[PDB]
Write a structure and sequence with these properties.
alpha+beta; 5-stranded mixed β-sheet; 19% helix; NFATC2-interacting protein
């Protein structure tokens, strides 16, 4: 919201059927969310790409670094 401990980000694939939302900590990088997402739908190992506002997320950016907030939209491509 404004004093956000963690940010609730909707991480969704190229398919609209492909659908997750997870709480990423503001200090913790996108990579820990990337690993969480794939584990939920058993893609553990077969890792997929992540985009936000067209920006390719390498993993080593933070959500507070990207300028994200609770109720955002991450995208997934594979």
């Amino acid at each position: 919201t404004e004093t956000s401990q963690q940010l609730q980000l909707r991480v969704q694939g190229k398919e609209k059927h492909q659908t997750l939302e997870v709480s990423l900590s503001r200090d913790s990088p996108l990579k820990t969310l990337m690993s969480h997402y794939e584990e939920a739908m058993g893609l553990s190992g077969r890792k997929l790409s992540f985009f936000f506002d067209g920006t390719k997320l390498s993993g080593r950016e933070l959500p507070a670094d990207l300028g994200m907030e609770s109720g955002d939209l991450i995208e997934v491509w594979g």
